[PDB]
Amino acid sequence: KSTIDAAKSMATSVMKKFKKSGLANSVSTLTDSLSDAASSISRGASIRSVGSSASAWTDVSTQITDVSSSVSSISTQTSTISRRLRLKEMATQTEGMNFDDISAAVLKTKIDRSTQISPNTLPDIVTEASEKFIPNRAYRVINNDEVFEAGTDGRFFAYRVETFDEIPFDVQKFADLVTDSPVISAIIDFKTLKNLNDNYGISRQQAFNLLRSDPRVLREFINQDNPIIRNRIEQLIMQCRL
């Protein structure tokens, strides 16, 4: 409501906030890191390419690796390779409910269910929502029935598109298959999945969808069944707390 050319220049101000924040610059970086990759010359502040060859996404992260100490190798790259893999990629191309689409939902929700929202506040708050929503989260890439899961921050696994399974995970096989293929915003991840597959019983049919993070098949359960699924979901809402 109200909006005397507020939500207006404000839908514009909400803009004039975005292009000056987390999501902004970051996306503006990956972009260059490609141009500057092929085009000019790879700013070699040390650079690796865990995978076939150089390609911003994989490598530029494979290298850099700033501000994350106290554990094991893999995790650190995975992580730093997550950072762009995630967020950054989303504002581009992918399937099923994409994290943010769970976020937007949070916003268009409260920003209506609220009472304390004058125009001045509209900006920022929206922006800030992006930078601080679903602190972490991971992704996956299927290829020959092999769920490769870059559990951002920490963790990482693999699966048979059929039986699921803690099969060798490799910074390599990972490298490429990530770089240029479609990714998936793993709504529900392993933990919830394996626990789900057992005390329960996921038809090959379903499962195959529960990966692409299909809207339907997911909606079903949460709507129908109600076991676990209703936490992996909910917990996320609770996470987009900002």
Partner: protein
């Protein structure tokens, strides 16, 4: 079903009593039984698996008998035997597992799998033998409709329940009175608290009570009862009943006064103990009632007097409690306990083969959910499934 049983004790008493050396005479009675089997089987054909991630496997039979000739046993004799056993082992495993997954509402007691349904057939009954395995022992006695019974160490009769009840409360939660508890497995801990230390209570005594209703009767129970609930003897910040805020619990413990434990059966007191801590026997009960009081100390040294003022704020919260543990007991119904692997075996086979949730058991064979709504169907299915797990563990662990 009983059929199944034999198949194993056959193999066990086999893979056990048959070795490079011993005299024939010690197995004569055995050897026979064995062969008898091979015969009845040969010619028949089977099928196991087909559900979830469980492989489908077909089996056929065409085996030679056993040399009832020899005096002693030569190495060669064994190896030619062990080779035949291993096919049956790898068989039974697949048979058990296949019937250890299927559930059924209507008749959740009888066999399910194409594999077993075929066994209950009459032509195979020619194999039963030595039913001393505690579980089968009780499986039979139940068919003939008679008094069964099992043995358990730290039984699992209490569904997990951890909560509180505020008998006196107010928004600030600065002068509460009530109880908090943890019922889980074979143990109960309950504390009664009164922020006012019974300052305005009749006889300066606040009465507390905790009642726990078992889903099945336990007989012959050996129980440890101790004063105090250590679990509720430390400072806590707890969520309010409505979840809208949090309250502070800062206990100071006093001895529970006029402790009375009653083990009731259908509303009748079967056993009652007044302030008796240590080991007590409850011979038959479906309910436990713990009554205890907080009595304001009539005489207090300065340090004590300082904790209990005549007016708020009440900063030290008088608490009395009890701890009760059922070490062992007998139940006419199967239950999970702290020693038997049955529940874990059934749950594990289902998890490993990604068996879909069925119509009888709660997702994941969740114990709390199961015991909370322990219907006749769940019990019949549980017993069938536990008995099969026990048959399997005679050969495969």
């Amino acid at each position: 079903m009983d059929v199944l049983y034999s198949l194993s004790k056959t193999l066990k008493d086999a893979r056990d009593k048959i070795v490079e050396g011993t005299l024939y005479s010690n197995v004569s009675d055995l050897i026979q039984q064995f062969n008898q089997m091979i015969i009845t089987m040969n010619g028949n054909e089977f099928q196991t698996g087909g559900i979830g991630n469980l492989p489908i496997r077909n089996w056929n039979f065409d085996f030679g008998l056993l040399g009832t000739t020899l005096l002693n046993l030569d190495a060669n004799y064994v190896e030619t035997a062990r080779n035949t056993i291993d096919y049956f082992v790898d068989f039974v495993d697949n048979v058990c597992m296949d019937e250890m997954v299927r559930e059924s509402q209507r008749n959740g007691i009888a066999p399910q799998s194409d594999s077993l349904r075929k066994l209950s057939g009459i032509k195979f009954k020619r194999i039963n033998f030595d039913n001393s395995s505690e579980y089968i022992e009780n499986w039979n006695l139940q068919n003939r409709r008679q008094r069964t019974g099992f043995t358990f160490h730290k039984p699992n009769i209490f569904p997990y329940s951890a909560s509180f009840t505020l008998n006196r409360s107010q928004p600030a939660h600065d002068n509460l009175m009530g109880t908090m508890w943890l019922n889980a497995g074979s143990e109960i801990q309950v504390a009664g608290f009164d922020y006012s230390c019974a300052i305005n209570a009749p006889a300066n005594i606040q009465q507390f009570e905790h009642i726990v209703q078992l889903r099945r009767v336990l007989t012959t129970a050996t129980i440890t009862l101790l004063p105090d609930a250590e679990r509720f003897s430390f400072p806590r910040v707890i969520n309010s009943a409505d979840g809208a805020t949090t309250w502070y619990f800062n206990p100071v413990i006093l001895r529970p006064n006029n402790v009375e434990v009653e083990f009731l059966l259908n509303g009748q007191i079967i056993n009652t103990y007044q302030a008796r801590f240590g080991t007590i026997i409850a011979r038959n009960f479906d309910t436990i009632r713990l009554s205890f009081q907080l009595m304001r100390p009539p005489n207090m040294t300065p340090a004590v007097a300082a904790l209990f003022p005549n007016a708020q704020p009440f900063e030290h919260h008088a608490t009395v409690g009890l701890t009760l543990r059922i070490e062992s007991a007998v139940c006419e119904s199967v239950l999970a306990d702290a020693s038997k692997t049955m529940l874990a075996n059934v749950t594990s086979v289902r998890q490993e083969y990604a068996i879909p949730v069925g119509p009888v058991f709660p997702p994941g064979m969740n114990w709390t959910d199961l015991i909370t709504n322990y219907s006749p169907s769940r019990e019949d299915n549980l017993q069938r499934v536990f008995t099969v797990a026990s048959i399997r563990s005679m050969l495969v662990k």
